[PDB]
Write an enzyme that holds these catalytic residues in place. Structure first.
Site, mmCIF file in Angstrom:
data_model
loop_
_atom_site.group_PDB
_atom_site.id
_atom_site.type_symbol
_atom_site.label_atom_id
_atom_site.label_comp_id
_atom_site.label_asym_id
_atom_site.label_seq_id
_atom_site.Cartn_x
_atom_site.Cartn_y
_atom_site.Cartn_z
ATOM 1 N N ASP A 48 0.847 -1.185 0.000
ATOM 2 C CA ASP A 48 0.000 0.000 0.000
ATOM 3 C C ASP A 48 0.886 1.239 0.000
ATOM 4 O O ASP A 48 1.966 1.234 0.599
ATOM 5 C CB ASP A 48 -0.930 -0.002 1.211
ATOM 6 C CG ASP A 48 -1.949 -1.118 1.152
ATOM 7 O OD1 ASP A 48 -2.131 -1.687 0.059
ATOM 8 O OD2 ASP A 48 -2.558 -1.434 2.196
ATOM 9 N N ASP A 66 -6.740 -0.007 4.607
ATOM 10 C CA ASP A 66 -6.639 0.543 3.261
ATOM 11 C C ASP A 66 -7.574 -0.167 2.294
ATOM 12 O O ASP A 66 -8.058 0.458 1.343
ATOM 13 C CB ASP A 66 -5.198 0.473 2.749
ATOM 14 C CG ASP A 66 -4.302 1.525 3.379
ATOM 15 O OD1 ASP A 66 -4.832 2.497 3.958
ATOM 16 O OD2 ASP A 66 -3.065 1.384 3.283
ATOM 17 N N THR A 70 -3.653 4.084 -3.722
ATOM 18 C CA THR A 70 -2.393 4.533 -3.130
ATOM 19 C C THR A 70 -1.221 3.774 -3.722
ATOM 20 O O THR A 70 -0.201 4.374 -4.083
ATOM 21 C CB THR A 70 -2.394 4.345 -1.615
ATOM 22 O OG1 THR A 70 -2.321 2.952 -1.303
ATOM 23 C CG2 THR A 70 -3.670 4.884 -1.037
ATOM 24 N N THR A 71 -1.358 2.459 -3.827
ATOM 25 C CA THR A 71 -0.425 1.661 -4.602
ATOM 26 C C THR A 71 -0.450 2.069 -6.068
ATOM 27 O O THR A 71 0.602 2.177 -6.706
ATOM 28 C CB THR A 71 -0.776 0.183 -4.461
ATOM 29 O OG1 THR A 71 -0.803 -0.175 -3.075
ATOM 30 C CG2 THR A 71 0.252 -0.664 -5.158
#
Lengths: 513, 513, 509
Positions: A49, A383, A82-83
């Site tokens: 993440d 997440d 986010t990744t």
């Protein structure tokens, strides 16, 4: 002092970013990995993440400051991507790089971008189909949003519990889960795992045979400040006005303990009538053995050490009012948990506050003996929680695994921005950052980010087919059937946080130290 | 001591610091902009189109790096804008002029070319400046909304101007509407933290944030009695000095409370009468003011007498030493609106003072307190162009075509002037034209052939009026395009620009003491 | 540094970190182990067999291995033999990726290889259970597993520590169908032999037994870390030689200042006092007068061990102790625990759960090496109680799994084809470890262990028989691990491996 100007300042920028970015590219889809993170503390952290890696440590550059900025965007505004968000910009940068490698203005190539993002946003609306917020329809989004974020098998068991958590709603519709997150990390024979346990869970509860482990009818006096003082919302001295006064309070301090249980033993019968309804004082400090026993002996459950959060979620969960004192309270304000259940798992008691009169707060029980395992599994949850919460907030859903990007890069077919071709190049530049998910995976997974994507491209150019690099083996398929479906909250925002920071560096011709 | 400093070295470093500071700022200029990103020695990056924001926050150096911010700040206060112009203008003139002319080896004729170029610049401006209506906020809009888009923000183009448009017209002076001189205490802006642009509107008058800070104070009582000191609350707030003891430790606590106990009586004689408003320029202490807030007497403090005098008459008042002493009677109300808005717990008292010198503190809001500022920063330049259209209804169109409009007009005067001075006066001319060229080289292609087409256009079509487009580079009409370079703002940047380079000319030498 | 970049953490750090931790086991695992001296911040020589024992004192900078040491401690508590195995197993598992790294197979790919195969292997582990045995009582039969589990963890007497810990673990309990964390504690005592060691169920204070003997049957204690120099609520007394006249008043006062103490001791009740601190001259002589047993000047060891076994808690001050602060033991008595005369309690059903194996020798490290053993005799017996399943002694099960997981690689095909082939390889470093302690190649072991091609018994262990590598039947040798042992030792060595095998460069400012 000194400065940097022209493309010299630019080169430092565009190089530092894409020097940091591809380091992050090691991880995306399930075929990504978990990047070892050791900050100044010395703890190892393994995350696919972005927010963890991005906001903990960085190889220090002027670009490393802006990357966490739009990284503070994606996880905040969405939590899925986010990744994914990082891998887009430098792929676009190397593209634009070519045009200024040709030589051109970073300003004119700036103007060649955002329209394409604005286009893709349109195109994103176009190619996607609005999908059900149904649990099992969410699964295909749930696994993927989790799986694009974190590795599959974790995301796979998360796919169940995260949806079970985001479907737990009263229909409080959010991009994230604030209350649905209550995380209990437990030392257990399972090193990586998360147990879904409904209702508010209390940090602890106190043992005693006379103290009811099972309270179905709860009249909850929230209890913080201990037995040892009379009518006190904070523990403080009634004494200690001189040196020898230090001995007098502790001699009279055992009195208030019996005074306090006296309040609670009567406040039970006051509020609860007989002792059949368990009167709940969750004492957020330690209960003194006498009143620990005497509340037990009277039927009151005196619970040891809830949380300030378990005090506020209680104010939510039980629909009753909390207190920082054990004082006799009017029977109205006393919280009611349709289940107050102390639960000893391992050696530790976790008291369920259940039948939440506002079950927006549920609890996840995290598993590991080893914190490095116990941290990482905790990390993959949330997440993806807000990621899959972006599934059940979104009636629109965007199919994942590069189904929608070939529906852009190809349908961006040029001379639509014919004017200077700088957009025709800028859209081309933007078109080339679209496929990083079909790239990074066939990269990570089998075959080629290129030789598979050409099929993806082709097979999409074939029959308008929704098609994509596998999250797993990196080969063509139909990404609509696979069910890999990205949150509708991701796609739009995923674009914005990219081209806005991708716009800045271009207009930045200057750096000074 | 034996020391001397020689010739070119300072002059070079002048020209050096002159052009370098001009570089990124002039590329940050225009519809096509750039960004100047500082990297602090600490690692923090600072990205601002204003190098004045960058340079002051970074190393400021003994050469013109010291003399650029002074003339920037000189350009900051007066009209309110041109902030980025002077340093790109002064860095522009000095380089092209000096070296070639110091290669012709002479300071003096260089000095004169400025005043030479000053009038032609005044000439072709005031000639090809286009008068726009002072009383038409729309004819104001297109000229005033042009100066908003100049730096970093087109966001407040409509909104700030709209709020700026009528207010400035509704301002007056001590010498009279607003017009005439530059007084910006009649331009005032006070923030409303948070809020919204909808809660915002045009406040053509002044607000006192400190008039009503509490619901207890006088609110919405529209015949105000403002009172200046002198009896009710006297000039002297000094101690009562009752039963003071130098030999007692308890008296130390007494003397500080005793200051306000006399002030207590000061605001109490306000209670004994209750003129609905009270102003104190040394400020009122709180203990006395609580009693003011008991009497519904709005307590005005920490805003000036001149401020209040301008506000009092403009809100209306009868000032007294004490209401039982009437010096003479004035009009009860000078304003049409007395408004107290509450955003946060703070109460903001907006008294619209129509056609009044007042303080003209105008209501403005962004969505949050930060973009609230960009209302003002644009409002200032908007109110600048508001006062400018009042000051100079005639103001030039240009994309910098004025910077050509002068230069060729210089050249065609230069051709008419001849002499050796021809060359400086022309070496000053070709300087001006790099400023708009940088705007339209940011556009692209051949900006010379543009300047060719420009100087073709110059006497052919027009000079500044039919201009060059800062977002395009083609020959256009900036009036037709709606882009406007304000006459005062134009000339003013140049007055400030010409002098610093003359100083840098004058200085081949400095000292350490 | 613990911060790194350059792919070391991926293709270097792990295989380096493992054999560091490991290659104790390689000479420390099997029918014996070869001790490895450890020095601490305290300078002294500590010989080690168990993996978690040499690694406990080893302080690692490795961001990699800090995952795995816990797994051994996990493995240790669980079973206790195979912690050695765990280090050397993952020694084979991880490094084989380097080839697949040279071959170019990605990270999760080959990890999925060992994973689905360690899933496949855990499936076969119950199938490869070879017979079984247990007694909730019998020393001898239980000793053999407790012998063979501590074999890896002991080079010393295999049968003698087999019989003690079997006795200890069993006979501290009314059942030993239940088994717990501390059912056995140790008073490490020198003199006589190391095989003079004896199992005495109860709390031994190898510390002085003082005060006049008052109770024998009543072992109930009011446990105190509070020294008795006169330390008690109203006046906390100490021993002060500062002046002579003040010492005269101490002897007078202490008799009474000690009076209200052993009073309040026996008030809340006990005839036996655990004093974790000092007891003064006239304080003890009053206990001689008061008729209470003060077991004085104890350790934190003898303090806590009691505080652990009786559930009571030492008092640093003197307040009347509660029953939470006062434990009871079967009987307090003076008897020799491996020929050492001090106070040795009896613990069965009063509070209980302490056997005392007196650890013995001519030094403490002999008591530390037999500490290595019986700790597993503790652990494995719980597994034995949890499952009486017996599985071929370490390395005799491997040759089974390798064959199975071999063709399982060709049931795999796809990049896990080889990774499972490599997982079939991940098994076999264990007898290699055994043969490398024996010094001989396992290459002869491997072919002979494959000679008959079943692998239910045949292995080459640590012997003078292995001096020329020779198939012996660990199954028949009495070397039979427990299924959970065989299950756990594979699980975490596969678990801690795959999670450290996806690690990337460390990011640091």
């Amino acid at each position: 002092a000194e400065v940097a100007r022209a493309q010299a300042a630019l080169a430092v920028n565009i190089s530092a970013a894409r020097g940091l970015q591809d380091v992050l590219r090691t991880n995306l889809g399930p075929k990504g990995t978990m990047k070892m993170l050791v900050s100044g503390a010395g703890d190892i952290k393994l995350t696919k993440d972005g927010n963890v890696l991005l906001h903990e440590m960085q190889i220090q550059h002027p670009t490393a400051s802006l990357i966490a900025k739009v990284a503070t965007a994606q996880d905040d505004i969405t939590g899925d991507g986010t990744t994914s968000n990082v891998l887009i910009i430098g792929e676009l940068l190397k593209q634009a790089d070519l045009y200024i490698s040709e030589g051109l203005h970073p300003r004119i190539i700036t103007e060649g971008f955002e329209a394409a993002k604005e286009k893709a946003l349109q195109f994103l609306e176009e190619v996607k189909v609005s999908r059900e917020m149904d649990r099992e329809t969410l699964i295909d989004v749930a696994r993927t949003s989790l799986r694009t974020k974190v590795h599959a098998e974790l995301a796979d068991v998360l796919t169940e519990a995260v949806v079970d958590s985001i479907l737990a709603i009263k229909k409080q519709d959010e991009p994230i889960d604030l209350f649905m997150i209550e995380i209990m990390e437990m030392k257990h024979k399972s090193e990586t795992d998360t147990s879904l346990i409904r209702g508010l869970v209390l940090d602890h509860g106190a043992r005693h045979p006379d103290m009811k482990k099972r309270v179905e009818d709860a009249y909850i006096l929230t209890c913080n400040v201990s037995l040892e003082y009379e009518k006190t919302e904070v523990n403080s001295g009634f004494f200690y006005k001189s040196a020898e006064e230090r001995e007098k309070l502790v001699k009279a301090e055992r009195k208030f303990i019996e005074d306090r249980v006296k309040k609670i033993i009567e406040l039970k019968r006051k509020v609860c009538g007989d002792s059949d309804k368990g009167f709940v004082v969750i004492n957020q400090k330690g209960i003194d053995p006498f009143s620990l026993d005497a509340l037990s002996k009277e039927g009151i459950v005196a619970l040891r050490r809830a949380k300030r959060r378990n005090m506020e979620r209680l104010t939510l969960a039980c629909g009753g009012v909390a207190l920082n004192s054990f004082d006799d309270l009017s029977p109205d304000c006393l919280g009611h948990a349709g289940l107050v259940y102390e639960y000893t798992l391992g050696e530790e008691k976790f008291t369920f506050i259940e039948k939440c009169n506002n079950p927006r707060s549920v609890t996840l029980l995290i598993k590991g003996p080893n914190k490095h395992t116990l941290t990482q599994i905790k990390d993959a949850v949330r997440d993806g929680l807000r990621a899959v919460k972006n599934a059940i907030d979104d009636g629109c859903v965007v199919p994942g695994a590069g189904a929608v990007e070939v529906a852009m890069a190809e349908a961006l077919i040029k001379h639509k921005p014919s004017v200077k071709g700088r957009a025709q190049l800028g859209v081309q530049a933007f078109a080339d950052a679209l496929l990083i998910i079909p790239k990074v995976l066939a990269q990570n997974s089998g075959f080629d980010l290129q030789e598979t994507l050409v099929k993806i491209q082709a097979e999409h150019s074939e029959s308008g087919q929704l098609v994509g690099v596998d999250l797993n083996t990196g080969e063509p398929m139909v990404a609509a059937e696979v069910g890999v479906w990205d949150n509708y909250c991701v796609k739009k925002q995923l674009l914005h946080s990219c081209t806005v920071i991708a716009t800045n560096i271009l207009l930045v011709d200057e750096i000074m130290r | 001591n034996t020391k001397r400093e020689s010739g070119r070295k300072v002059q070079s470093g002048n020209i050096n610091a002159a052009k370098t500071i001009a570089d990124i700022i002039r590329t940050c200029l225009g519809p096509k902009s750039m960004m100047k990103m500082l990297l602090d020695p600490m690692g923090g990056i600072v990205m601002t189109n204003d190098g004045n924001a960058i340079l002051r926050e970074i190393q400021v150096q003994h050469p013109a790096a010291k003399s650029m911010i002074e003339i920037s700040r000189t350009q900051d206060e007066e009209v309110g804008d041109g902030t980025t112009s002077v340093i790109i203008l002064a860095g522009e003139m000095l380089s092209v002029a000096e070296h070639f002319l110091e290669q012709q080896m002479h300071p003096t004729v260089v000095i004169s070319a400025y005043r030479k170029a000053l009038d032609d610049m005044i000439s072709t401006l005031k000639k090809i400046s286009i008068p726009v209506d002072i009383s038409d906020s729309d004819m104001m809009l297109n000229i005033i909304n042009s100066s908003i888009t100049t730096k970093a923000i087109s966001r407040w183009s409509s909104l700030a101007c709209n709020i700026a448009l009528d207010a400035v017209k509704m301002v007056q002076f001590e010498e009279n509407g607003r017009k005439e001189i530059d007084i910006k205490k009649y331009a005032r802006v006070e923030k409303i933290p948070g809020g919204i642009i909808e809660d915002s509107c045009v406040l053509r008058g002044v607000m006192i944030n400190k008039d009503v800070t509490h619901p207890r104070m006088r609110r919405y009582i529209k015949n105000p009695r403002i009172v200046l000191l002198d009896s009710s609350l006297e000039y002297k707030k000094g101690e009562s000095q009752t039963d003071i003891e130098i030999t007692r430790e308890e008296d130390f606590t007494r003397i500080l409370q005793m200051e306000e106990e006399y002030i207590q009586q000061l605001c109490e004689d306000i209670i004994q009468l209750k003129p609905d408003v009270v102003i104190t320029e040394k400020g009122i202490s709180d203990l006395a003011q609580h009693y003011l807030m008991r009497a519904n007497i709005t307590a005005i403090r920490r805003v000036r007498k001149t401020d209040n005098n301008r506000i009092a008459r403009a809100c209306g008042a009868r000032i007294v030493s004490r209401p039982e002493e009437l010096r003479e009677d004035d009009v009860g109300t000078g304003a049409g609106l007395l408004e107290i808005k509450k955003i946060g717990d703070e109460y903001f008292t907006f008294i619209t003072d129509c056609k009044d010198p007042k303080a003209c503190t105008i209501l403005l809001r962004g969505a949050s307190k930060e973009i609230l500022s960009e209302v003002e920063r644009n409002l200032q330049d908007a109110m600048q162009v508001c006062r400018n259209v009042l000051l100079d209804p005639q103001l030039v169109p240009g994309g910098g075509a004025s910077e050509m409009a002068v230069a060729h007009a210089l050249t065609e005067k230069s051709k008419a002037m001849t002499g050796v001075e021809q060359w400086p006066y022309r070496a000053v001319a070709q300087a001006l034209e790099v400023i708009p060229r940088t705007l339209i080289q940011n556009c692209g292609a051949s900006t010379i052939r543009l300047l060719t087409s420009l100087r073709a256009k110059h006497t052919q079509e027009n000079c500044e009026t039919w201009g060059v487009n800062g977002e395009t580079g083609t020959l256009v009409d900036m009036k037709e395009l709606g882009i406007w370079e304000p006459l005062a703002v134009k000339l003013q940047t140049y007055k400030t620009a010409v002098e610093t380079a003359v100083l840098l000319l004058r200085i081949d030498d400095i000292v350490s003491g | 540094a613990k911060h790194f970049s350059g792919l070391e953490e991926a293709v270097y750090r792990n295989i380096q970190a493992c054999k560091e931790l490991a290659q104790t086991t390689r000479t420390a695992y099997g029918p014996n182990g070869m001790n490895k001296m450890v020095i601490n911040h305290l300078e002294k020589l500590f010989v080690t067999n168990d993996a978690a024992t040499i690694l406990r004192e080893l302080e690692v900078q490795h961001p990699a291995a800090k995952m795995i040491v816990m797994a051994s401690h996990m493995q240790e508590q669980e079973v206790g033999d195979g912690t050695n195995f765990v280090l050397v197993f993952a020694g084979a598992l991880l490094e084989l990726a380097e080839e697949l790294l040279r071959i170019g197979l990605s990270v999760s790919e080959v990890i999925e290889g060992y994973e689905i195969a360690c899933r496949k292997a855990h499936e076969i582990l119950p199938n490869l259970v070879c017979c079984s045995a247990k007694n909730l009582r019998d020393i001898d039969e239980v000793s053999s597993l407790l012998r063979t589990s501590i074999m890896s963890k002991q080079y010393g007497n295999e049968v003698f520590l087999a019989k003690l810990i079997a006795q200890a673990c069993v006979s501290i309990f009314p059942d030993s169908g239940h088994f717990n964390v501390d059912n056995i504690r140790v008073c490490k005592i020198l003199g006589s032999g190391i095989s003079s060691s004896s199992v005495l169920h109860g709390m031994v204070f190898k510390k002085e037994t003082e005060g006049d003997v008052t109770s024998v049957k009543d072992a109930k204690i009011a446990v105190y870390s509070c020294p008795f120099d006169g330390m008690i609520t109203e006046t906390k007394g100490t021993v002060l030689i500062k002046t002579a006249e003040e010492l005269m008043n101490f002897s007078k006062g202490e008799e009474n200042l000690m009076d209200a103490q052993v009073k309040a001791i026996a008030d809340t009740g006990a005839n036996v006092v655990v004093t974790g601190g000092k007891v003064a001259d006239m304080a003890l002589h009053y206990a001689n007068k008061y008729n209470i047993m003060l077991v004085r000047l104890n350790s934190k060891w003898d303090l806590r061990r009691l505080c652990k076994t009786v559930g009571a808690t030492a008092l640093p001050r003197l307040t009347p102790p509660v029953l939470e602060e006062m434990g009871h033991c079967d009987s307090v008595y003076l008897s020799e625990v491996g020929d050492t005369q001090v106070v040795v309690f009896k613990h069965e059903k009063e509070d209980g759960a302490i056997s005392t194996i007196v650890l013995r020798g001519s030094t403490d490290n002999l008591m530390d090496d037999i500490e290595r053993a019986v700790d597993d005799g503790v652990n494995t017996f719980k597994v034995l109680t949890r499952d009486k399943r017996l599985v071929p002694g370490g390395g005799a099960t491997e040759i089974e799994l390798a064959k199975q997981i071999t063709s399982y690689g060709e049931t795999c095909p796809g990049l896990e084809q080889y990774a499972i082939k490599k997982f079939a390889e991940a098994f076999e470093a264990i007898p290699r470890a055994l043969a490398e302690n024996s010094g001989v190649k396992a290459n002869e072991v491997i072919s002979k262990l494959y000679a008959v091609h079943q692998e239910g018994n045949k292995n080459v262990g640590l012997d003078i028989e292995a001096e020329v590598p020779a198939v012996k039947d660990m199954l028949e040798a009495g070397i039979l691990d427990t299924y959970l042992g065989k299950y756990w030792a594979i699980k975490l060595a596969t678990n801690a491996a795959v999670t450290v095998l996806r690690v990337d460069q460390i990011i640091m400012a």
